[PDB]
Amino acid sequence: SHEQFRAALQLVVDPGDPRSYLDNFIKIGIVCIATVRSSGKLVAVKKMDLLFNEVVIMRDYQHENVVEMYNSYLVGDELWVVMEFLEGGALTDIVTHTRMNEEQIAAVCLAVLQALSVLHAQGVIHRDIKSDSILLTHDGRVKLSDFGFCAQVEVPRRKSLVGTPYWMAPELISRLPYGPEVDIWSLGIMVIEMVDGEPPYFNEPPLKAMKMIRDNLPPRLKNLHKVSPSLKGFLDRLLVRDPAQRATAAELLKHPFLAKAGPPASIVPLMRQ
């Protein structure tokens, strides 16, 4: 915190306020929810009073798979963010108790990939890809959340120590320069999550795990006993230790595993329980 580091802040932010059109607020828990007098839509804000990276970077972007960040303001020492609110939860409330299928799995994967595919050419990297950063509509539509760790990359390589260890890239843990390909390794660990329910080494304290991520072969499935050879095949391309022999998002859409993705509706009954 500092009011000079908040100097390059205010500028990149709309002025005025939201409660000129928006009004019927209510603390819900996240913070608030208002209404649009023009239509009646409600929004959910997250108030406050680096992190630089969400505001500037993603204020220039919008995808149907990314919770839309509408507008940004502050009164005094307090930032107001209008945001696309959804009721439908995170994939973590699902993976942890029941066992998904390839149709549901395939749908979370390509959904996640539809985002990455444009976020990446656009020169940005999530850096915290895991089930926990995925949100769902009540209807069963799939989106990518939580860009509290992102950054904009001449400068095509990066090396900042960030994310969540059990999902991290070896090149990233190993302090070898990486690119967006890290986001690609993370998907596979989220895949292990969808099949077995947990990320590898999750029994371990994070740091030693980061060693075991560091110097063991790519992680293998404990299930497999109910695993179509196609999920292996897809899985088998994303868990590459050599960053360069690792498959690309552009490649993965063309993958036959993805013939099995289901509609939103096909996903709905997982949250229903």
Residue numbers in the entry: 300 to 328, 334 to 353, 362 to 465, 468 to 587
Authors' own words:
PAKs are serine/threonine protein kinases that are regulated by Rho GTPases of the Cdc42 and Rac families (Knaus et al., 1995; Manser et al., 1994; Martin et al., 1995). Group II PAKs (PAK4–6) regulate a wide variety of cellular functions, and PAK deregulation has been linked to tumor development. Comparison of five high-resolution crystal structures comprising the kinase domains of all three monophosphorylated, enzymatically active group II PAK family members revealed a number of catalytically productive and nonproductive conformers presumably representing snapshots of catalytic domain movements during catalysis.
Finally, we solved the structure of noncatalytically productive apo structures of PAK4, PAK5, and PAK6. In the apo structure of PAK4, large regions of the kinase domain were disordered, including parts of helix αC, the glycine-rich loop, as well as part of the activation segment. Evidently, the activation segments remain quite flexible in that crystal form despite the presence of the activating phosphorylation site at residue Ser474.
